[PDB]
Design a protein around this nucleic acid. Structure first.
Lengths: 184, 220, 109, 104
RNA sequence: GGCUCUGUGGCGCAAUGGAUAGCGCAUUGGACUUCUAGAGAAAUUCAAAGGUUGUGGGUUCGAGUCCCACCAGAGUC
């Protein structure tokens, strides 16, 4: 059981051997936010600590792999507090359900802010593989404007990616629809 | 040495094969990544500056004369040399100081949980500050006499910078999260008025990714 | 409304004169307020369904699922995943085609 | 209801020496060209936006950072920077690259 | 009028260990993806340049690395 330090709504991993066991065994990545001791004047390659998304932290917590601790005692993520204000929101639950559903299938996942989406879906390790999809999380009853779908389709065509639409049904199962440009 | 390796050695792939040739490049790329996170810094004791953290007052005060970084960072009061918590954290992570606390040495950890707090600077602001500082910019604090937080000078002004009379900054920034609503017209107008005659830049942080957008008025 | 029939006629004219399709027929579905241009691009080949739509309208996800189910029912060929195309037109007869399917099955642009 | 807004936008951009055309393939409303002979085939891409005079407004486009990022990324090959028009204020949005602006 | 700190390719900086001066961003040249020339942000990615180490003296088997003078500029009493 590896240790994760959660405090003020951020999850950081400091050990260099717990990061290795996360990537190979559970297929969860992350973004490094520190500065390299060797080259601390650049912005290309960074070092420890490693930043975990809230969905990743919850997934590690539930399935019994790591123990969440407060800033120096075990922490409970099922009650809203100052160290965990993520409990009791619709968007966070939506994103967590979609993340878990896609993770169970065997995909790698990452952030897609620059590409106008929610997640990036990989066929394998982000090293040695191009991303295939740009996933968007939509509530089942929301209305999607048509002017904001053409831009997504054009960006996907220009970057060679496909757009995914995700909307979890109240039965605990998620349905996916694929959109792409067709030339005729 | 001084050269650093490349993340993926060459162009990436499109579809997995599982043909034992795609499973060797992956191993070679993976084993060269954790050889880099395990490295730790070391410095001679003859070029370290000591300092002490004072949470009661809210500064970091030096006990030795400062070095080359004094031309752009720090502030002097009552004859002593003092630093802001974010400047102190950047200097510690860069390795220019040897911060203590009640005669007890500190680490890079157990100091992210003393200086990074809602009372002092936050996490996103420190991220943007260090991102700009590693590129050679001069980053300062915005004194009025979402809110404007920093003053940024270009990298050409470092050589002859003067702390007492710096002049007109290149721009000034307001740090924001990525999943938060876009400000309306009134907020942007008030921010433009408060900034003055200099450009305003919006910094968005998305789980460790920073992008900047500039909002200009009066196209024609 | 005349918008749907006008856009359907524009799409039919485009598919005839420009894309040169044959035996394109208009079938009505007076339950979802939609018009399907079930035609045949090449003689002795598979069928297709086109749902014209102006840029003013907006689509949810339940509507998309219902449209795929209706298209599968019309095709009556439970051998391929549900799919249909969407046509968007403007006042100066500019049409853009996007194809919507089911599942992932699509690593291309 | 948007026909009137489009009409005022077209008339306002028609009075000057700009010929406007509709752009549907880029997610915007209009594309402003200039001059008779072609110079760049594109000068601006305008997103028409309407707000009310109480600092809240009824927005037909729920703009956020993701949508703005996607629009800016798309509107680079066929325009010369995005343009937000308010019904008049003309706010122009562009991308600031951090490693290309540290020296002149 | 003293005291403290600083001077290296176009810019920011290393050379800690006595070396022989090289990392990053810019500039240049290639290979790919895409659009109606152009653009490229984990759809992007490789290679290469180059320079009185501020100006003179001594010590150095040996000087960016030690001592003095001179020039320039940033704080403080």
């Amino acid at each position: 059981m590896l240790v994760v330090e959660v405090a003020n709504g951020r999850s950081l991993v400091w050990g260099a051997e717990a990061v290795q066991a996360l990537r190979e065994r559970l297929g969860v990545g992350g973004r490094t936010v520190g500065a390299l001791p060797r080259g601390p004047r650049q912005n290309s390659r960074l070092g420890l600590p490693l930043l975990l998304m809230p969905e990743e932290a919850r997934l590690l917590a539930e399935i019994g792999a790591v123990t969440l601790v407060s800033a120096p005692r075990p922490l409970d993520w099922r009650v809203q507090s100052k160290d965990w204000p993520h409990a009791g929101r619709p968007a966070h639950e939506l994103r967590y359900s979609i993340y878990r559903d896609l993770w169970e299938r065997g995909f790698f996942l990452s952030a897609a802010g620059k590409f106008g989406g929610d997640f990036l879906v990989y066929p394998g390790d982000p090293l040695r593989f191009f991303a295939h999809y740009i996933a968007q999380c939509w509530a089942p009853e929301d209305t999607i404007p048509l002017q904001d779908l053409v831009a997504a389709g054009r960006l996907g065509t220009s970057v060679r990616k496909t757009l995914l639409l995700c909307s979890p049904q109240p039965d605990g199962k998620v349905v996916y629809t694929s959109l792409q440009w067709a030339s005729l | 040495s001084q050269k650093l390796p490349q993340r993926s050695h060459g162009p990436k792939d499109f579809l997995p094969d599982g043909s034992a040739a795609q499973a060797e490049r992956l191993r070679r790329c993976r084993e060269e990544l954790w050889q880099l996170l395990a490295e730790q810094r070391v410095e001679r004791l003859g070029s370290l500056v000591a300092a002490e953290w004072r949470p009661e007052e809210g500064f970091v005060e030096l006990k030795s004369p400062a070095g080359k970084f004094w031309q752009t960072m720090g502030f002097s009061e009552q004859g002593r040399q003092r630093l802001h918590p974010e400047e102190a954290l950047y200097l510690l992570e860069c390795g220019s100081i040897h911060l203590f606390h009640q005669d007890l040495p500190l680490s890079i950890q157990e100091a992210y949980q003393l200086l990074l707090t809602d009372h002092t600077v936050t996490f996103l602001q420190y991220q943007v500050f260090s991102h700009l500082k590693r590129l050679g910019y001069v980053v300062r604090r915005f004194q009025p006499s979402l809110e404007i937080i920093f003053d940024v000078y270009q990298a050409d002004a470092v050589a002859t910078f003067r702390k007492n009379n710096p002049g007109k900054p290149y721009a000034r920034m307001c740090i924001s999260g990525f999943d938060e609503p876009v400000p309306d017209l009134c907020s942007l107008k008030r921010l433009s008025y408060q900034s003055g005659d200099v450009p305003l830049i919006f910094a968005l942080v998305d789980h460790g990714d920073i992008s900047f957008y500039s909002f200009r008025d009066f196209t024609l | 409304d005349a918008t749907q029939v006008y856009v359907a006629f524009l799409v039919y004219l485009d598919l005839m004169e420009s894309k040169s399709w044959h035996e394109v027929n208009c079938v009505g579905l007076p339950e979802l307020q939609l018009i399907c241009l079930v035609g045949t691009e090449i003689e002795g080949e598979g069928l297709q369904t086109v749902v014209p739509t102006p840029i003013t309208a907006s689509l949810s996800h339940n509507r998309i699922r219902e449209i795929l189910k209706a298209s599968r029912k019309l095709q009556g060929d439970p051998d391929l995943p549900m799919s249909f195309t969407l046509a968007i037109v403007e006042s100066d007869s500019t049409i853009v085609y996007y194809k919507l399917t089911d599942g992932f099955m699509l690593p291309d642009p | 209801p948007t026909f009137r807004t489009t009409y005022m936008a077209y008339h306002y951009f028609r009075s000057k020496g700009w010929v406007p055309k509709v752009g549907l393939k880029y997610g915007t409303d209009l594309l402003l060209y200039r001059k008779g002979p072609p110079f760049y085939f594109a000068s601006y891409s305008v997103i028409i936006e309407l707000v009310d005079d109480h600092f809240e407004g009824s927005l037909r486009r729920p703009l956020s950072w993701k949508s703005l990022a996607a629009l800016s990324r798309v509107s680079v090959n066929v325009s010369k920077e995005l343009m937000l028009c308010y019904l008049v204020q003309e706010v122009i949005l562009s991308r600031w690259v951090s490693s290309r602006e540290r020296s002149d």
